[PDB]
Amino acid sequence: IRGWIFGTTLDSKTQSLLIVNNATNVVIKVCEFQFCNDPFLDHKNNKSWMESEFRVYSSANNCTFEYVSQPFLMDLEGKQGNFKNLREFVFKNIDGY
């Protein structure tokens, strides 16, 4: 997984919130973005090393500040099968926050 889009019309008319997670970083950003771009993704097993990604944002506008910090995702070593982690998230809005 990588990020969530929050907005009213998913366009650059208003400030729409986006999240971008690096392998060792997270970026949480609200600004006016018109349409997220998806890079070329047709590769399953030949490309074991995952690279040539990111650059998914749109044209810049009147942007606020980001929250570059340590990522929250933690992975444990999968040993002897069926060892995976379930991640839970809740988003809400009380008095704008």
Binding site: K13, T14, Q15, D95, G96
Partner: protein
């Protein structure tokens, strides 16, 4: 003649929630022959000053 930066949203469909702004224009009508033209009559333009 004023600095003309007195833009107030006049009317819109939704009463605003606390600490909420709308960076948008509208062609508010109140409903008859749904219109999006710049004409003042029955296609009333908010954001006066």
């Amino acid at each position: 003649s004023g600095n003309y930066n007195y833009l107030y949203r006049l009317f819109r469909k939704s009463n605003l929630k606390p600490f909420e702004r709308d960076i948008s224009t509208e062609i508010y009508q109140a409903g008859n022959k749904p219109c999006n033209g710049v004409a003042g009559f029955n296609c009333y333009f908010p954001l006066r000053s």
